[PDB]
Each structure stands twice: as C-alpha cells, then as structure tokens.
Design a protein around this ligand. Structure first.
Ligand SMILES: [Cl-]
Lengths: 254, 145
RNA sequence: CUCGAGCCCUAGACAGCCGGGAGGUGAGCUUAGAAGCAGCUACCCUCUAAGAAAAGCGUAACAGCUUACCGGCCGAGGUUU
C-alpha cells in the first residue's frame, strides 16, 4: 500500500499548531490565498492584525485539524480545495467578510495578463535619469518630454484599459514607474460562527440600503414629531418656521 | 524641476522656496524639521488650503552611524569591532522606521537593527549574535516591555 | 530480462504545469559605483505556508531569467544502490 511507515514529525507538529489556532478565535473560516505576492500578503496580515489571523498550511493538514475539532467544524472540509487558508477572529461573521477588502491587492501586473482595472499612466515628474526612459514611454503611451530638471510626463491620457493584454516592455516601464493597476483580492469560501456555517452566497449580502433604511427611519420620527402636539429637541424648528407660515393658509388663501 | 531635498533643518533654500509661491509659501516648514540631520523627503503638490507631504525614511545601516560614531564598518565583522552601541540607543533606531520593518513591535524591530549590527561589527555589548537569545529570554524587557 | 538492499510515499511521494520565492537590504568591507552573484569578512533578523547576507546563467553597474524553499492542480508508485 502507498501510505508511509511513520508519519513525519513536522506534519504532526503542524496539525497541532493548526488545531491550536483553530481553538482560539471563536469564529473561524477558510478563504482563498487566490494568488497574491508575498509583500502584498504580508501587508494584508500587517493591517493592524489584532482582528483576524491568517493561517496557511497544506489543505490536508488543515483538514486533519478540522477533524480533531468538528463539534461544529466538520462541514468546513467540503470548502477546502485549491490554494486556500484558514482565517479566525473574535469578530462577527458579517463583519468578518468585510475588512478583508481593506488595503488589498495593489497588484503590479506581471506581463502576459489582462487587468479589469485602468492601466492609465498619469502626468507628473519621475525623472529617473536622462536616457532611454524618454523612449521607453514612447513605445507604449503618451510621450515623455524632458523639461529643465529631468524627464517628465506630458499627457494624462490612457495607454491601455481593458479587453487585451499588457506589452512586455510596458510591464517593465510600469514596474519602473511603480504602477500597480489591478484588483483581485482575498476571497472567502465559507465561515463558522456559533452552531452554523455561513456561505457568502446566501445571507451574507451587505450598506447603502441599510443607510437608506436608517435615514428613512429617522425621517419617520420627524414626520410624526410635530403631529404629536408635543415638544422635541432637534424637531424644535418645526413650529419655529411654521409660526408665521401656515397661519396665512387660514387667512390669505381663502 | 522636482520636489525633494535632504536635511532635518527648516526650508533648505532653492528646491522649496522658489517653486512654492502661489499661493502657498513656507507653510510646509514644519514637516522636514525632523531631528536627524538627514531625512530626504518628497512633497506632493496640494490644493491652496495647506500642503501635502510624505517622509522618506533613511536606511538602517546609516541610521546606526549617527549614533555609534565613526561610519566605517568592520572589515571583518565579528572579528574587528567599531565598536559599541548602547542598548537603549537601539530602542531609538527601532521606533524610527515603522513601515520599513515588518515587525509588529519594537522587540522584533530591534532584532533586525541588531541583525544588521552583526554585519558592521557593532558589538552592542559583548556581541551582536547573542542578541536573539538574550531578548527572547526577556533580558531587556525593562526597555521594550 | 531476473534477483536483492536502503530511503521517500494517499498526512499525496517522483515528474510536469500554475502560483508564491517577501522586508530590514542596495548586508558590511573594498570600490568612482560592488546592488545574491569582481574580491575580503561575516552570513545575522523579521514577516511567514515558505523564500539563501544566494546555487547558476546575466549586466559597465542596476535590469532580467532561473535554482534553493512553500502552496495548489494531479493521483500511485518513486528514488538511490
Ligand atoms: Cl486555487
């Protein structure tokens, strides 16, 4: 049979560490890792920490750990395939699927790819050094003119936007310019709350419509405030502007 | 012309004053006054209201020069010594660059600083190499913690 | 073609393909500049699933291409002798 003889030590230690992480953070979930560069992933882990913690390992070692637990955490296994990693937090599930968006994926766009974002190069002064850089921008986008201190960028217009890929040389002048125009992100495949698992597709919808119903409720009170024949605080200007106003509707009107 | 200049002084002449005239003048003088003098920085164009700036943070190897004295590093590190750098001085260099380091606190940030200090033969007390053990044993906690 | 021995492997090996190979930092010294990679010495430290103070190309020097190292896809043997 193709199983090994003795399970290697580090595989055992890692399953323990993963279980340890899982034990804390009363809300736990699996997300993506998508594809994402190291420095960018660090900066996702480097945002304040202290809210959620990202735990990466082999999908099999994450799946071992969920089987050691599982009073609730078994069903989290069907959501583990692909590149993927564990997340856990003391925070709420609904606030969990947010803040993941916070400072995510600058995405430098290596050559050979199509980005849904705008690759437009702006106008300003970079001026690395007088040289082929003047001609480097010429073979891609709006010309670079050298004015009195160094090379500069003239036109603020677009080079490429969407529907095709990036030039190889552009990718290198986008790297020299320090341009990262793409958005991918760290997804969330599922999460476990108290007794139940939350799939992002259902019940996880989000904020304007809440801020739309929340202002509609405050306007619901001020609409009934002066019709109460009562006295209010901020609604005190109700009668103040109705003093000399509606009085003429019973006098001047008819 | 561009906007940038070293120094921890106030308004070091021609890069700043001449270019900034309408309508902002000298209102940016507060930002570049940082103690170390050098702090090369870059000022972004702004609206008429105030100004906008960012602070470029100097390298770590050169950050320990302005503390430990003579700037020549060790020819043979962990052999010849510069020599010394005080322990609380390292605390200062560590709080200096927050984003330039990946650490979540001063404790680990210090380790990187002293990490580099091995290369220059900085010999913080007895030797830069012993530092990780010492600080992991909670030696210097009075400083950091 | 046959007979052994060791090691690795469904806690997913071997190969391939995809993704990631990060920050202090362009380590110090040398040098006009010596940026993993002319040379001498050291070879620490963080973030990590993991990533050398760089194993090999490459540059006038930086680009740039890989190797180490980690994750995924795949699934049954692989590898040394
Ligand atoms: Cl995937």
């Amino acid at each position: 049979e193709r199983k090994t003889e003795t399970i290697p030590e580090w595989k055992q230690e890692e399953v323990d560490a993963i279980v340890e992480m899982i034990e804390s953070y009363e809300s736990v979930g699996v997300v993506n890792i998508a594809g994402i560069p190291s420095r960018q992933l660090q900066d996702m882990r480097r945002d304040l920490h202290g809210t959620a913690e990202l735990r990466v390992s082999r999908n099999t070692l994450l799946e071992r750990a969920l089987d050691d637990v599982d009073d609730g955490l078994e069903d989290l296994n069907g959501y583990i395939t692909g590149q993927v990693g564990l997340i856990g937090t003391d925070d709420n599930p609904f606030s969990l699927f947010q803040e993941l968006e916070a400072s995510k994926t600058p995405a430098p766009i290596g050559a050979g790819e199509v980005a849904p974002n705008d690759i437009v190069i702006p106008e300003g002064d970079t001026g690395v050094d007088p040289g082929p850089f003047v001609g480097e921008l010429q073979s891609v986008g709006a010309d670079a003119r050298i004015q009195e201190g160094s090379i500069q960028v003239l036109s603020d217009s677009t080079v490429l936007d969407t529907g095709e890929e990036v030039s190889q040389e552009l990718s290198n002048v986008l790297n020299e310019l320090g341009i990262e125009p793409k958005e991918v992100g760290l997804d969330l495949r599922a999460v476990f709350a108290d007794g139940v698992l939350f799939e992002p597709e259902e019940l996880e919808l989000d904020x304007x419509x809440x801020x739309x119903x929340x202002x509609x409720x405050x306007x619901x009170x001020x609409x009934x405030x002066x019709x109460x024949x009562x006295x209010x605080x901020x609604x005190x200007x109700x009668x103040x502007x109705x003093x000399x106003x509606x009085x003429x509707x019973x006098x001047x009107x008819x | 012309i561009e906007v940038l200049v070293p120094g921890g002084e106030a308004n070091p002449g021609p890069p700043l004053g001449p270019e900034l005239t309408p309508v902002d003048v000298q209102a940016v003088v507060q930002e570049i006054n940082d103690q170390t003098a050098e702090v090369p920085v870059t000022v972004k164009y702004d609206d008429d209201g105030s100004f906008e700036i960012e602070v470029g943070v100097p390298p770590t190897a050169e950050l320990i020069k302005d503390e430990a004295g003579f700037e020549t590093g060790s020819g043979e590190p962990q052999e010849d010594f510069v020599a010394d750098l005080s322990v609380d001085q390292v605390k200062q260099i560590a709080e200096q660059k927050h984003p330039d380091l990946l650490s979540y606190d001063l404790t680990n940030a210090a380790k990187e600083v002293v990490g580099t200090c091995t290369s220059l033969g900085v010999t913080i007390e007895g030797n830069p190499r012993e530092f990780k053990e010492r600080i992991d044993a909670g030696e210097y906690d009075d400083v950091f913690a």
